[PDB]
Amino acid sequence: AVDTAEQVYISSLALLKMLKHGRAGVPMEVMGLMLGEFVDDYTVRVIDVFAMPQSGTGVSVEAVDPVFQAKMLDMLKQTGRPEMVVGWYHSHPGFGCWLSGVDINTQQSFEALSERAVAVVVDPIQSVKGKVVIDAFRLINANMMVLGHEPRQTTSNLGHLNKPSIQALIHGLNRHYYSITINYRKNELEQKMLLNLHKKSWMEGLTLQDYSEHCKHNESVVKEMLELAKNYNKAVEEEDKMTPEKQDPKRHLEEHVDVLMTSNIVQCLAAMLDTVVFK
Amino acid sequence: ALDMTTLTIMRYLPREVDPLVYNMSHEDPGNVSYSEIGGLSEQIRELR
Amino acid sequence: EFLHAQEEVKRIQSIPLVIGQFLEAVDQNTAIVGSTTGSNYYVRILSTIDRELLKPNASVALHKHSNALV
Amino acid sequence: ENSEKIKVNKTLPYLVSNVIELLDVDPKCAVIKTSTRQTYFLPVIGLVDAEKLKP
Numbered sequence A: 001a002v003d004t005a006e007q008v009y010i011s012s013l014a015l016l017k018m019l020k021h022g023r024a025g026v027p028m029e030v031m032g033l034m035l036g037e038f039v040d041d042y043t044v045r046v047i048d049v050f051a052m053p054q055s056g057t058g059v060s061v062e063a064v065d066p067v068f069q070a071k072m073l074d075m076l077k078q079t080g081r082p083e084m085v086v087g088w089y090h091s092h093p094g095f096g097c098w099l100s101g102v103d104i105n106t107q108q109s110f111e112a113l114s115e116r117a118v119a120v121v122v123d124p125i126q127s128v129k130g131k132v133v134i135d136a137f138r139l140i141n142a143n144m145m146v147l148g149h150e151p152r153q154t155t156s157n158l159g160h161l162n163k164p165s166i167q168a169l170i171h172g173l174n175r176h177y178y179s180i181t182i183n184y185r186k187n188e189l190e191q192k193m194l195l196n197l198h199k200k201s202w203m204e205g206l207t208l209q210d211y212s213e214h215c216k217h218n219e220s221v222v223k224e225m226l227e228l229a230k231n232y233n234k235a236v237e238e239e240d241k242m243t244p245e246k247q248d249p250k251r252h253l254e255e256h257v258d259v260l261m262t263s264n265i266v267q268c269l270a271a272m273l274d275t276v277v278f279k
Numbered sequence B: 001a002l003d004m005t006t007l008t009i010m011r012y013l014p015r016e017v018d019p020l021v022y023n024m025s026h027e028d029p030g031n032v033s034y035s036e037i038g039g040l041s042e043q044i045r046e047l048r
Numbered sequence C: 001e002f003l004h005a006q007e008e009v010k011r012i013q014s015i016p017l018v019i020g021q022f023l024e025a026v027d028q029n030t031a032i033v034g035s036t037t038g039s040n041y042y043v044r045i046l047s048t049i050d051r052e053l054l055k056p057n058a059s060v061a062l063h064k065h066s067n068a069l070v
Numbered sequence D: 001e002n003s004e005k006i007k008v009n010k011t012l013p014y015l016v017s018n019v020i021e022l023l024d025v026d027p028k029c030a031v032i033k034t035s036t037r038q039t040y041f042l043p044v045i046g047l048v049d050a051e052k053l054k055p
């Protein structure tokens, strides 16, 4: 009854918990459990994540404190969270997402505790700049690989639409553990809630920058214009129709005039609106 | 000093290092008055 | 979409880069750089960099992790 | 509980290192030169008293 390409769902709050806890413990690996639901054979929905204390043993089954997690679950159930532990995660700063031998042993322990619980690996320093690096793993039973079978029953084009990162397979991807496709089940409510962090406030929308700094920026961009115009004359002089070799004048002048124009229009228009509005 | 994660500077510090110089400064010679030296009045006066 | 892609291209050359020395280039899109870490790497170069600025003793900033020279 | 957690926190690799200037705090600061030939600044010394140290 091997499971197919499948899918894993993490809530947005879960992902933010993941990244916060991962970045906090850097450069030491940190590990916590995932709370969620196994829904069906084709999806796994982790809904919320709680961290667990660091220990000198490092990320291992020795690190999971049964009393801590037990009391934590007992407390969350009273507050609205009855979901069971669907898996665990641990941070791997400094290198890509993959399971080490101790990680494999921990995942085997969780598998013994379960039937299809997953392991999640987050690199908290590579996941940065808007790029997020999270991968979900599950061990391939050696018996199945021993007797020449594929890891899963490929049914739909789902799955293979993703590609394995080369870094992982050196460490053992598609050999002892297979990567399950990651997906984010955010609703519109969380998305609009999250949008407030960069959302433009009205006074900030009507802010008029700084006239002196605006003029200084204009002068610098105009200097770039002059240099690029000299190079544009130089480039138009080479029109002798030689072999076909954007660089130097053309592209730079085009984007520079675009940015200078849009800045000038936005500033002048906003100034006019303020002149009309406030009095 | 820099964060080991983002490398962003978060504090300038007193200039440089090297506790070797610290030892070579905090060396304790003991109380030796010029009178405890004898027969070098011209040189002692010269040094000051 | 093109504006979003350029915003990301700006993002990739953000602050935390590592400095290196640009040895001779190889192709239009790749080059050889000597990192301040001591080792040298075969590195693809970002297109937005003006190639005429590139000289075999130029000081060039590499991606912190991927060593990509932008 | 605190003592047990601290003790289990005291792993036993320790990467011995030389101590450098104990710069005054300003909004318990030590600078370390590691045996692996790296220098580090500590916002807090740790589990040892400040004056027990000598650069």
Ligand SMILES: [Zn+2]
Binding pocket: A029, A059, A090, A091, A092, A098, A099, A100, A103
């Ligand atoms: Zn691990």
